Design a protein around this ligand. Sequence first.
Ligand code: NA
Ligand code: NA
Ligand code: NA
Ligand code: NA
Ligand code: NA
Ligand code: NA
Ligand code: NA
Ligand code: NA
Ligand code: NA
Ligand code: NA
Ligand code: NA
Ligand code: NA
Ligand code: NA
Ligand code: NA
Ligand code: NA
Lengths: 325, 325, 326, 325, 327, 326
Amino acid sequence: GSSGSMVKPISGFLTALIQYPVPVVESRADIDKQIQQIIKTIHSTKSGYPGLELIVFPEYSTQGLNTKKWTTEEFLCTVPGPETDLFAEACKESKVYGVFSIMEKNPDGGEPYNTAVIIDPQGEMILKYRKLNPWVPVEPWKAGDLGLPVCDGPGGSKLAVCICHDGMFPEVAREAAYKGANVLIRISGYSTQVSEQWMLTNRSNAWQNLMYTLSVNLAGYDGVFYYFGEGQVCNFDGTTLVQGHRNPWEIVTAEVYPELADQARLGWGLENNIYNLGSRGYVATPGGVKENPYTFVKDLAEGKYKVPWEDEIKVKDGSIYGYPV
Amino acid sequence: GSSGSMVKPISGFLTALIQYPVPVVESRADIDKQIQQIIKTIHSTKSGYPGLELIVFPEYSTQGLNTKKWTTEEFLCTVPGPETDLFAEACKESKVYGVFSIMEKNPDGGEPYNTAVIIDPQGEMILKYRKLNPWVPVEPWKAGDLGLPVCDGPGGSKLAVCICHDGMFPEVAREAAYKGANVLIRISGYSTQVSEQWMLTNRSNAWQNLMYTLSVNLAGYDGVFYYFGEGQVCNFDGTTLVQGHRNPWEIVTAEVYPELADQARLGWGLENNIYNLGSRGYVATPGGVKENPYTFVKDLAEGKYKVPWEDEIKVKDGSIYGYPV
Amino acid sequence: GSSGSMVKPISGFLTALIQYPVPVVESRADIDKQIQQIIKTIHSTKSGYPGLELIVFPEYSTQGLNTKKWTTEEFLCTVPGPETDLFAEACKESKVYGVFSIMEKNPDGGEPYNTAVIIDPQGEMILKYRKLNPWVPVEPWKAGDLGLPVCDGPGGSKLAVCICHDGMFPEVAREAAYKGANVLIRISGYSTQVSEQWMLTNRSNAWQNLMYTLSVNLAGYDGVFYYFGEGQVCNFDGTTLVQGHRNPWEIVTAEVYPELADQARLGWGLENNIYNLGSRGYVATPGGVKENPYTFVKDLAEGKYKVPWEDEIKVKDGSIYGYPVK
Amino acid sequence: GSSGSMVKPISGFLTALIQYPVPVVESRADIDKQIQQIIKTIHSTKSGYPGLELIVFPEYSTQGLNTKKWTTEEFLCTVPGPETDLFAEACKESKVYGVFSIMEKNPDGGEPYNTAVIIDPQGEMILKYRKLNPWVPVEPWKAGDLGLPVCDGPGGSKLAVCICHDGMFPEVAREAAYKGANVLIRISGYSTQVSEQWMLTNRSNAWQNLMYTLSVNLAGYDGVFYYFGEGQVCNFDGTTLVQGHRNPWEIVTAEVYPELADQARLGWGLENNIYNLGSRGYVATPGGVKENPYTFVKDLAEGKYKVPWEDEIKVKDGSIYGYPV
Amino acid sequence: GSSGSMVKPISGFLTALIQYPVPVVESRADIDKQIQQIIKTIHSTKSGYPGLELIVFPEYSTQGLNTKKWTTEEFLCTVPGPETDLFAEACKESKVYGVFSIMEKNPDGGEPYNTAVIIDPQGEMILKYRKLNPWVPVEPWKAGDLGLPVCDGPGGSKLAVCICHDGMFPEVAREAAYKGANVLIRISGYSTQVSEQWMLTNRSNAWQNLMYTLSVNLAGYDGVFYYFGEGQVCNFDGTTLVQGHRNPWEIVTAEVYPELADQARLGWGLENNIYNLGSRGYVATPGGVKENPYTFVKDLAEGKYKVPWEDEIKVKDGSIYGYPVKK
Amino acid sequence: GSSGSMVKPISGFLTALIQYPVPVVESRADIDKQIQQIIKTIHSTKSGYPGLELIVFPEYSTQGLNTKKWTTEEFLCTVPGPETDLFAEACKESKVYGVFSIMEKNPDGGEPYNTAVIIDPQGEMILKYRKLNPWVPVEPWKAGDLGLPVCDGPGGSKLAVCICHDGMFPEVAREAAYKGANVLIRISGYSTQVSEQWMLTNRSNAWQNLMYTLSVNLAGYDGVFYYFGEGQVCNFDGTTLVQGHRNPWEIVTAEVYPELADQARLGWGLENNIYNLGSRGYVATPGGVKENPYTFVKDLAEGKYKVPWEDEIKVKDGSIYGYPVK
Ligand code: NA
Ligand code: NA
Ligand code: NA
Ligand code: NA
Ligand code: NA
Ligand code: NA
Ligand code: NA
Ligand code: NA
Ligand code: NA
Ligand code: NA
Ligand code: NA
Ligand code: NA
Ligand code: NA
Ligand code: NA
Ligand code: NA
């Protein structure tokens, strides 16, 4: 990749990551005002960067983090719904791919999901993802049930999205890559608690999988936490190409060349780790050793991952934040 | 942890990571010479740091990387054998735990293993590990078949060792932690190709698992590659506490406090990721959702991990380095 | 220490350092407004971080830096007084230790002090400190007369506070440690002039004394200076564990483990400097050489510290900032 | 200051800091060898940098750290003596100021001193300093008894020297400045244990006192420790101007402008800390408050500095390193 | 230099670089507001830093970047004019040198210029510079026609100013030095696209010419771009002495010692590059070889600089930003 | 680019920059030893990195910096000559492009040149460059007279080479780019005096020209100077991709993708500076303003570049290093 210009590059695409100000949301009218602001930002960012093809908004940019109201019906939406339809129309008008965050009413009447979507330049929803790893114990969201999907994006990209806490699990980035993604998008609403670990994992998620990472967090203060922004683009070898600071409204742009990541995946010998993981020691054993050597992988596959100190873990429900058990 | 002093700390232990000069080895006599030099280093390092409890030598410190001879009978050892017995006697005399690298004859006559051992202050071998992920296509070693073991170490530690390339797989660090390790040791013989990614993964391996990492590579030139050294100690939150440069014989020391990592594992709410991985969204679903959402985990567990571009991967054997297919 | 979570750690405590926006204060009503905002921040920060035990506000967070009014009666408070009582009630309700800044009317009628207090989770004032080293020539405050006190804090801590400019004097950090502190708190209202030296001294103050440092400055623009924020937590070996940027309202949190600093003080050989300072060369001389080798220490002790170029120093009063020379 | 050229600057002087290889010294003949090497280095460095006025060698550059022989008569010298005479002749011939390290026989037959000298371009010894703060418990040296002297140096400098561990005490840098020094020279023989804290204190020692710092350590391995080098020049505001790495024989040069430090001392208002220390709150109290507010200063002045936990300190003699009672 | 205090240093001067908030400007009334705010900032900054002698405002601090109105008559000014007269009165009252940005009506009726001025402590305009390298294709400004002037400044300085994109051309910094400048001031209204390259070029512009650099950008969001601030002072050897972050209203101050740069220029042997450029290999050839070895220098001098891939360059007019393509 | 693997990438090429130990050279026999060692390094490096296409050796790697002997006939070579023939045979055998440094006898008997060559995988010399900017006053070399040439390299590259001090002149990097280079190679024998400025200029040379930079210096001590190594690969936007430290024999490798730099040159709008330099303000003036605004460019083009303080410059000959003046 590169820090880029304002044009569609010959190889690849231009992205803008928006360090969107954290919303303070008290009612549905406030959600409508965030929707209008997000839409305004799509058009304005396209006017400033005419070659733009992928614009990325953070987790909670639509609805905020009003922890006293965020699972009320007033604060939830269907996906797709009227709100994603408005985002879609704006993506169609500006001819961009957009990434949006919606807290989603559960269609079966159970606990709501934390959802991300990608909409293409024709206004079609091409990816819907439900956050696999809610940020417990503060978050009430149901664990996502759609796996980690991938879609075709601009400039030969294969895109996956993950949300905030998801990106701390190397299993999320590995899965994205395994499903074919050469660009992992991470949209986020973290407080300052993990500012260093955000940058660190954006780099490791990239390197381990020969995959670009594009990552952005909300920025500013909502009366409880400060959200750090730190929009970040990492090359497929883990090198940071562009890094935002902690200001509301910082825009982080870069040229990304997906073909280079694909080529490394096809071409690399030493450090072709995405391939090596499941085909070990291929010089000694033609084709590589396929059997799994990791007990955690077996246990997790079987739905019985259990750390040996689990009985002594103190925080296992939401009571510390006042959620009923 | 801390950059420390030369004493046994009240809560933990003192470690010395040796950026051992890369050996140039032409015969078994040269291996004997390296053995003697390693042993000399155990005693000298203990004399300089009287509180020392864990001394760590890099991969290939015993035998070098003579790629024309490294799988000949002359260049291989049994584990345990006379060579590990000499290391053991030195650990007993200096009253330290030691970590050593031996290229190991395969007891069935097949391809040899790349092995690491931990020996305790009584001279007992308490851990034997065979490199799970050889550095293909340059390395001829058989994929390890002993899993990733853990043992009791000094200062309340639970130690695991991995070797070089292994530490680029987040699955290795995750497995170590899952088996109970609160300190992952990475012994390494990498060339300069991965200097940045070495530091990056030592940090991410620590953070993702609330685990200390202690990591050291050979240093210097062997006539083919330059080996970067870069001994590194990372806190359980991923923060680098001490970092060596690229000189032969640099010694990197630090105080490590294993109980702090155990306590974070028992105590942390937000970012208790080692627990969260297999018990998702516990606020919405009491006890957490246990079902595996990752296709790669299923496929790997089933011995059928296969990336979707596998047929187009160019490097699948050792022919580029002159190994017969 | 560590960058931490939102829980009370098993060995220590969780702290939040608030890069409070610099207040623009024109009247007593504005001071009341800041008090309300500080109190609101205590409750809101505790709700976000349930394990929180120590919340730290910067210098001038209560009253601002209105240099045309800051020594008028309207802009000063008694310590304790109604304002610290309101802070105390908030610390009691949220069950936290709090650190606050109050410009203090001098009880004898002389020049006012720049004061910091620590209030415990029962709402008791457990520490009162008057700034030893006013930021001259801009600051009008009387040099502090209470020494550098220490108190018991959360998680086995022994806390000391210093204010802004104080932390540029290694003598301040040394004194805190010598009085028993294993955590030095620095509350500050600096402009951008010293941004780099802020971070540097927070590290050196820690390392030299085998002591944690927790330090935070106001952030934002007041119409004259930009205040840099840069909340910072340093390990007892000087390593920065967490670092804020320059934004108003950034919260910097960390886990601190005071017992690790105490243990290093008891255990370290090489680099046990807090002990070595006054007991030199103990291998050659059993018990160490005790006699003072520093002329500045003697002179300062005797109230006659005088640099050899003192007669040629140009700035010796507040006239450059329009203070009358008295 | 500046990273400079190879000329005598119009306002100041050029310095070369030598990351001299740590000597391995087994006899007096080896000490003679180091003397010859040091002298060779004076001449060669002057030939390379014709404007050079101050060359600085590290602690133990003459005699090494043979901890089994370093207090024997064979390994000690008188100061002045034949060895400093040879250094002096070399300074005279090359027309430079030089800074040298000698372990010094105690003229009364008691424990030896660790000594530094400055010799001028006429071959006169203009400064003799005995290490105030031996690095206990490893070092056997008697605590210095000459205070912290200052002398006139090149380019309007007032020079002080301190040794290794001394520079960890802010009281040493403060004393140098109080005696009139505008350049503090730190010659050192530290192991890698304090690499970070070396750079940190070289910066703080400068900033706190509006003083340049010029600091250099031995580099390389002596069979026990690795010595980090890291020659460092800091501006009077604490900014690092030039920084060496950890290699034997690295030369760190810089232009230093002493009059700029003197001018800041005369001119600065805010942050004139060297003046402010003993004259507090001068706006409220004309002339400043002079009384000492620091108990440690009183106690130290009275020869009774005693930390409140002193009875529980574990390391109070050299027994951990095998020094008798 | 040094991070400094708030006094006039004995050898040099104190500067304040203002990371002025990017204005959102809809009308002339908004331009008048910015003028008042700039003036307020001059007085307030002087009150905070009594030794201050040079205050620097960014490009577009007066008029913003309203790309739909920025070349209308309502949004342009004459230089000098009533607006620079108000800046001048404020410099006189506070006794400082000031650096200001004005989008300038072209006196011949052609396309407007992007202009910077320096005003001295007596309120006299001592430098006027028209941006040589407009930020194309977004900017409509006429390429500057006044060269790169220099003037006398405080503390023995010889000042030059350049504007934003200008500082990406090493030819600009070289020219400033060649004309005698020992301090190059760069005033800027860049978006985040070049945040790293800003810091990099401020250092290289300094080192290559044995020249101090003082550089500052607008900060904040205007509804289209985020402007990064990053006020920066570099020593004459390229070392960064002080660095601002990306916040609106950050003030970056430093002591600068111009005489140290002059002395290096007179004194340095190895790396006296500003001299070496045009007198090569003087040990082998007494006086140095003077002939041009660079084809680009010849071509540029002759007004025929043409890169060998020029015919394939895609962006050669303003159409991608909706500017009509003329002639 | 990328930190890469050991393979020929699908879009570009793999390079190895050798931080070759500084030679201490006392005679022609020592030069022959360096030639053998360089050749050995070509073969060994190819064995370690089978996809390698470009290997780069530093300035003075063949002959050292024996300043008392370096212009004697014994220490000089012809270019081409037997020595470059041996390098060429090694490049042919290993199938790599190689970059070498030779101090070159002047064919007219005058002062010698400091020369760099590029040899291709068929053993053909495809580029010869004489150092334009000798490192005065220490260097005795004649100012180069061949301009700054360019050649075709591996992976669609257009290569230029410059030598040490040359890379401190932005005019050198600009010229390389103007002649078509998308990869500038800088081979160097600097002392530690310019360590920081080396890294800085390698980045600015890249960014200003939308050009990759590949740069490497000798490393180690020769009895006079320490040579810093610091092999460095910069992306065409100025971002450092790989950075060596100061050790002898460090090998710095990277994948470089020349077509990405060409594409940015064709495609970029904002910051297409290599184009913008000579066609200014093209929105206001169709085609851009072509007239030169820089007096230094006019003066230099006219062979009359003269700084206004030139009469007061103190160092104008080699006398400070003992070179006779005339
Ligand atoms: Na638009
Ligand atoms: Na950007
Ligand atoms: Na269990
Ligand atoms: Na593998
Ligand atoms: Na297995
Ligand atoms: Na423990
Ligand atoms: Na994993
Ligand atoms: Na330099
Ligand atoms: Na200090
Ligand atoms: Na790599
Ligand atoms: Na000869
Ligand atoms: Na020739
Ligand atoms: Na490399
Ligand atoms: Na010409
Ligand atoms: Na000519």
